[PDB]
Amino acid sequence: SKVGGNYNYLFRLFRKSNLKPFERDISTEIYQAGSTPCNGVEGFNCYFP
Amino acid sequence: GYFKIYSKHTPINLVRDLPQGFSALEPLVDLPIGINITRFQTLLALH
Amino acid sequence: IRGWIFGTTLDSKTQSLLIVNNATNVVIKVCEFQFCNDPFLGV
Predict the structure, then answer these.
(1) Fewer CB atoms inside 10 A, N or C side of chain C?
(2) Which segment of the chain is annotated as a signal peptide (chain C) (predicted)?
(3) Which of B31, B37, B45 is nearest residue C6 as measured by Cβ atoms?
């Protein structure tokens, strides 16, 4: 038990891009998502990550 | 991420004849870790 | 060649894999040391 509220847990039911597992990195090591110009943000037929 | 160290040592060609021989490669050292890699190219080696 | 490079982007503006192996123990240090481009030390 611990009182104060919880905000740490965050999962997804869908995601847009395909990430890179298992690299303990703090740089801008980023992957690209797709072709439709969603630009990595919410748009048309782009599920919330 | 078993970056298994498959190292066949055909040492530096020396002066005249360290004979070219067995092709193909065989395991020597084996370690699984699992660190992300997507694509790559050829590299080099160090002393 | 002075430096070990591996990864998907291979840039290391971050913690970087400090792997030292001397046929006895292989180190996995995800954080960098103070030798970025071409390490050199009188030894």
Answers:
(1) C
(2) none
(3) B37
> What is the Cα–Cα distance from B41 to B36, expressed in whole angstroms?
15
- B1 and A22 in contact by Cβ < 8 A? yes
Torsion of CA A41, A42, A43, A45, to 10 degrees: 110
Closest by Cβ to B36, choosing from C5, C7, C26: C7
> How far apart, in Å, do the first and last CA atoms of chain B sit?
25
Please name the residue of chain C whose CA is at the shortest distance from the CA of residue B31: C26
Experiment used for this model: cryo-EM
A26 touches C: beta carbon within 8 Å: yes
- Listed residue (B27, B9, B31) closest to B18, CA to CA: B9
Q: How far apart are alpha carbons A43 and A40 in whole angstroms?
A: 9
Tokens of B17: 């004849």
